[PDB]
Symmetry: C3
Subunit: 462 residues, 3 copies
C-alpha cells in the first residue's frame, strides 16, 4: 500500500518563463506528464499532485492525464511556496488521518525517473525497515543539488542544500535525487519539527533526514548508478541537456530494433513515434508527436514530421509535414510542404516545391513540380503538370494528364482520362477524355530585338 506525492507547486522562477516549469516539454511530453506516466505504471493506490499559483492551468491537464491513464489522480493545493517540506505537508492532507501506507515523494522536475527505479526504492525501503530511504547519485557537476553528508562509518547524517553548503561541502559529488520513501508517522513527525532558519528561509524537505537521525530512526541512502534517471531540471540549460540524453536513449532503442540512424546527434524522435525495420534516417531529422514510419523507408535529411503516417518502402526527403498520411512506396521531397489532412496514396509522388493541404491524392498519382494543391481530391495514375495551382473543392479523376501552368478554379470536376493544355485556366467541368484549353496562339514578332533594344547584348541576333 503506497501513496505517491509529486511536488509541482514551486514557482519555477529559474526557467525565466511565463509557462509553468512543469509544462515545459521534452520528446513530446511535459515534464509533469513524464512523471505521472512513470508513476501510473507503478500503480500506487493513491497518487497526489501538489499544485500552487499556477493551479488553474495545471489541474486540467492532470485531469486529462488521469483519464488517459485510467486512474484517479488527486490534486492538493499549496497556497504559498513555503518550501518542499511545506509542500509535502500539503500533499498529506489529501490522505486520510489514519493512512498507514508508505509515502513516496518525488519532484515534478525529475522527468526521466521510471517505474523500475521507483519500485526498487519501495522494495529497499520495506526490506531494510527504514523510516526514510532517499535516492542518491554521484555526478561530475553537483551544482545546485543537495549534498549527501555521511559519518565516518558511511552513515547518512544529513542533506545540505547548495545555498547552505560550506565551500568544502559543495565539493561533495554524491547528491540528493529528491526521491524518497518514508514511514508515514515518522514523516508526519519530522515535518512538524521543521524550521525555516536557513539561507533561503524555506521549510526544506531535506531537513527531515537529520531530524529522523536525531530520533535514532533508520536512514538509508539508495545509490542510483544511472545518474540521468534522477537528474532534475531547474533551468533551460538542464532541460535541453536531459532532452538530449533522453533522445539518445530513444534513438538507441530504435537502432537496436533495426533502424539505421546515420546521425543520432541530429535526430530527434518523440517518445510515441514508431519506426519499421531497415528504415534509414538521414541527419537533421525530427520525428514528432504520433508519427509512424513503416519498414524500408528512407527518411531523407532535413525532414520534420509531426503526426504523419508513412507506409512501408516510402521515401520522405527534405519535407516539412503534419497530420498527413503517405502510402507504401510513395516518394515525397525534396523541398515539400504537407499541411494537415494530406493523404497521398501508395506509389504517389509529391515533388520539389510542392505544397499540399487537406487534399486526397490517389494511388500512383504524381504532383512533381512547383505546385499548390488545396482542398482537392485526385484519382489514381494521374499526372499534374508543373507550376499549377488548385485555387480553393475540385475533383480530378484517374489517368488524367494536366498541362503545365494550369489553374483549377474551384469548384470544378475533371473527368477520367481528360487532358489540359499548357497554360489553361480551368473554370468549367471537363468531360472524361476531353482536352481543355484557353491559351491564345504563339505570334513571333520578327526583329523586335533590333528595334526595341538596339545595342544590347541580345542584338547578337546579327
Amino acid at each position: 500500500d503506497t501513496a505517491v506525492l509529486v511536488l509541482a507547486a514551486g514557482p519555477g522562477t529559474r526557467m525565466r518563463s511565463d509557462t509553468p516549469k512543469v509544462l515545459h516539454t521534452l520528446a513530446g511530453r511535459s515534464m509533469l506528464s513524464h512523471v505521472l506516466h512513470a508513476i501510473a505504471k507503478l500503480a500506487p493506490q493513491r497518487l497526489i499532485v501538489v499544485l500552487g499559483h499556477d493551479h488553474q492551468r495545471i489541474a486540467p491537464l492532470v485531469g486529462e492525464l488521469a483519464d488517459t491513464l485510467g486512474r484517479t489522480i488527486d490534486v492538493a493545493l499549496q497556497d504559498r511556496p513555503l518550501g518542499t517540506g511545506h509542500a509535502v505537508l500539503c500533499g498529506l492532507s489529501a490522505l486520510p488521518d489514519d493512512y498507514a501506507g508508505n509515502v513516496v515523494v518525488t519532484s515534478g522536475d525529475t522527468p526521466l525517473l521510471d517505474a523500475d527505479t521507483l519500485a526498487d526504492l519501495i522494495a529497499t525501503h520495506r526490506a531494510v525497515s527504514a523510516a526514510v530511504t532517499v535516492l542518491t547519485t554521484t555526478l561530475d557537476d553537483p551544482f545546485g543539488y543537495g549534498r549527501i553528508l555521511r559519518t565516518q562509518d558511511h552513515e547518512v547524517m544529513a542533506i545540505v542544500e547548495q545555498t547552505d553548503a560550506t565551500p568544502s561541502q559543495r565539493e561533495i559529488r554524491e547528491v540528493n535525487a529528491g526521491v524518497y520513501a518514508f514511514d508515514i508517522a515518522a514523516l508526519r513527525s519530522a515535518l512538524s519539527r521543521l524550521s525555516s532558519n536557513n539561507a533561503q528561509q524555506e521549510l526544506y524537505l531535506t531537513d527531515v533526514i537529520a531530524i529522523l537521525r536525531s530520533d535514532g530512526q533508520t536512514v538509508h541512502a539508495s545509490h542510483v548508478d544511472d545518474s540521468a534517471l534522477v537528474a532534475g531540471v531547474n533551468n533551460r540549460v538542464q532541460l535541453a541537456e536531459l532532452a538530449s540524453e533522453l533522445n539518445r536513449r530513444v534513438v538507441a532503442a530504435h537502432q537496436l530494433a533495426g533502424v539505421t540512424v546515420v546521425d543520432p546527434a541530429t535526430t530527434w524522435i518523440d517518445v510515441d513515434v514508431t519506426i519499421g525495420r531497415d528504415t534509414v534516417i538521414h541527419p537533421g531529422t525530427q520525428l514528432l508527436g504520433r508519427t509512424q514510419i513503416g519498414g524500408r523507408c528512407v527518411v531523407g535529411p532535413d525532414t520534420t514530421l509531426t503526426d504523419v503516417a508513412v507506409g512501408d518502402g516510402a521515401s520522405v526527403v527534405r519535407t516539412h509535414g503534419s497530420s498527413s498520411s503517405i502510402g507504401d512506396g510513395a516518394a515525397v521531397g525534396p523541398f515539400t510542404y504537407l499541411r494537415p489532412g494530406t493523404a497521398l496514396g501508395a506509389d504517389g509522388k509529391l515533388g520539389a516545391f510542392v505544397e499540399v493541404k487537406n487534399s486526397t491524392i490517389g494511388t500512383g498519382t504524381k504532383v512533381p513540380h512547383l505546385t499548390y494543391v488545396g482542398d482537392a481530391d485526385i484519382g489514381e495514375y494521374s499526372n499534374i503538370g508543373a507550376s499549377s495551382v488548385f485555387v480553393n473543392r475540385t475533383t480530378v479523376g484517374s489517368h488524367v494528364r494536366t498541362g503545365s501552368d494550369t489553374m483549377f478554379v474551384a469548384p470544378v470536376t475533371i473527368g477520367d482520362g481528360a487532358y489540359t493544355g499548357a497554360g489553361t485556366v480551368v473554370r468549367e467541368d471537363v468531360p472524361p477524355g476531353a482536352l481543355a484549353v484557353s491559351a491564345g496562339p504563339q505570334r513571333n514578332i520578327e526583329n523586335w530585338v533590333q528595334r526595341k533594344r538596339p545595342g544590347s547584348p541580345a542584338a547578337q541576333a546579327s
Copy 2:
C-alpha cells in the same frame, strides 16, 4: 609471405537487418569494402574472405572489389556458422596443405582497421617469434568484447567472451581486437583441439590462445592505443558511433589541409570526396560519393551533394544535388534541386525553387526563380524569367531573355538573342532576335468589386 583471412560468414542477427552485416555502410563504403581496401594496401600474397549464408550476394561485390584493387581475392565458404574458430578452418582450406607463411585473421566488422596497424602486427609477430600475436586495446566500455586475462607476471593466459565471463571478469577493460597473427602449424594444431562447450555452444577462435599457452608456445598481446582503429560493429548503435568517429577524422584531415568546417559535428564527408583550399563548409552538410569541391567555394548550410563536381569560387547553398557539375564562380541555391546530368557553366546561376534535370546551361546564364528545367540545352549569357517550365529536348541560344511565366513545349528552338513576353506558351521555333508572345491584352472591369463582392473589406474601393 602472408595470407590474410577476413571472417565475414556470421549471420549478423544483432543488426536486425535483411541487409547482410558486412554490407552496411559508413562514409561511402560497406564495412567489407573498408576492410578489403586496408588489406589490399598491405598487399599480402593471399587474401581470403570467408562467406556464409549470404554468399550469393556478397561474393559478387568481392569480385568487383578485386578488379578495382587489381589483385585476386579468394572466397571460402562456411556452410553453417559454427563459430569464429570454425570460420578460420574454412578459410585455411583455400590455402595449400603445405602453406608455410604466417596467417593473419581479422573480422569483417572491424571497419577502421588500417594497413599500418596490420603491418605493425606482422612485424611484432616476426620480431618476438610468436606462435600467436593478438591485437588488444582498452576501453571505458568493454561490453560484448572478449576480455584479456593476464597472469600475475603480465602474461596473456586466455581470452574470455562476454557471455562466458565471471561478473569480476567483465570488469576487465583490456579487450580483444579480434585481429591476430599466427604461425600456421601452431594454428592448424590449436583449431583441431577446439571444443564448443561454452555459453553459446560455438567453436571460438579466441580459445586458441589458452590452447597454445598449454603447449608452452609464445603468446603476445600487442596493445593498440587508438582504440577506434580496432573497434567492432555488432549492432546499429556501434555502427553509427564508428561512423561518427570516422567522420571526425575525415573532417580533420580536410581542416588541416585548408578547409574551414564551421561545424564538424554536422558535416558528413565521404572517404573519396576532395575539397579545395579556403573553401568554407556551413553546418548541416553532407558531401557524398565522389563529390569534388574546388578552392574558395562556399558550401552553404543544409546542402547534400552526391557525385557533384563544383569548380573554384562557386557558391552552393541549401541545395540537394547528384550527378551534376557546377562551374567556376557559379551560384546555386538557396532551395535548389539538381537531378542527374545537370551541367551548369561557369558564372551560371540556379536560384531559389529551381529544379534542373538532364540539362546543360551555358556560361553566365541565369535561371533564378521558381522554375523547372528538364531535358533542355541553354546557351551563354541568357536569362530565364521566373515561374517558367521546360515541358519535356529544347534548345535555347545565347543572350536570350525569356519572360516570366513562359512554358517551353518540347521540342522547340529559341534563337540567339530572342525574347519571350511574360505569360507565353512557346510551341514553335523562335527566330534569333524575334519576340514571341501569346497572352491576350489586359481588360479592366470597373467597379467589379462593388458589384460582385458587396460589403467585403475590398469595397474600401470607396
Copy 3:
C-alpha cells in the same frame, strides 16, 4: 599604468589559408576583433598591435576597430617573423624609452581571453611584485603548447616548446597560455639576452622565463582553471573546436535568460544577436550578425538569419534571410527566401516557396505560395495569389486580392480593393475596385484523347 601588446605578426602557415590567421572568424568576429574587444574593456593606457607581412590588410581593420571602441590603438611593424620574443621587441618600440608601466603581452590567436582574466593577471602581478607573471592552464591534450617546468619545490623554472621538448617533457599537461605580465626593465633586459639556438631557430618569448630566473627575479605562474579562456588557435581544427565552445557559452546565457534552445549542439548564435523571453529555437538554426528576435517567437528548424529584425510572437520556419525585418505576429516559412531590404508588416505572411527582395509588405498582407516579390510595395490586408511574379517598382494597395498566376509587369499601380483574375498579365494600372483580366476563355475539345492518344491509359475515357 599598463601597456598591452597583441602579437599578430606571425605567418599563420598552419591555417593553410590565403586569409590572414587573425582574420578568421568565430561567432561573428575575427579572432583579432575578439582580442581587441576584450582589451578595450580593460582600457589600458596604451594598446599596441604588432603586424607583419599582411600589415596592409590588417592595419585598416584595426583602425576601424579603434573608432568603434573609441580609443587609439597603435600599430608596430615586425618586418620578418623572427619569433615571439622578437615580436615583443617590435611592440616595445612604439612605447617611449622612459615608459615605466607594466607590459602585458598576449597573442592574436587566443580569442576567448576576457577582460576579467586580464585584470586578475595584472592584480596578481602587482600583488606578488613579480618581474614576470605567466598565465598557465592544464589540459588533457597539451600538444603544440609550451610546457611549464617546475622545480621540486613547485617553482616555475622555464617553459619548453613542443618542438623542443623531451618525450618525457611533452607528457607535461600544465601549459603556457602565452599571456604574460612583465616589469618593463626586467623585460627589456631579458629580450636582449635571447638567442635563437633552438629547434625552430626563432627568438622565443618563452625563453625570458628561464632568463629572469637566472637573475633571481620573481617568476609567478597564475593558473587559469577555465582552460578555454586561454586556448590558442593554430589550425582550423583548433578554430572550429573553440568556435564550438564559444557557441555553447552563448547558447547557455540565452537559455539562462529565458530562451528555449531545443538543440544547442546545432544552434549557432553570433555574439551580438539578441533574443526575447520565451522564444523557442528549433534545431539546425544559425542566428548571425546583428539579428534580433523578440519574445515568444518560434524560430523553426533549418533557418539561417543574418541581420534580421523579428518582432514579438512571430514564426520563422525553414527560412534563409538577411537584412530584412519581420513584424510582430508575422508568419514566415517553411521554404522561404528573404533577400536584403525585405520589410514584412505585423501579421503578414510569407509562405512556402516564396522569395522576397527589396520590397515592403504591409500589416496583415499575405503572400503564401510559390511567388516572387521584387522591388515592390504592397499595402495592408492584401492577398497575393499563388504562383505569381513581380517582374522588376510596382505599387499594390490595401485590401487587394490578386488571382493565381498573375504577372505584375513593373511599373504598374494596383488600386485599393482591386482584384486580378487567375492567369492575368498586368501591364497597366488597375483602378481601385476594378477587376483586371487577360486570359482567354476555356474551350473543351471533346474526345481529343480517343483521337490523339489512342490505346493510352487515358483512353479510360471509355
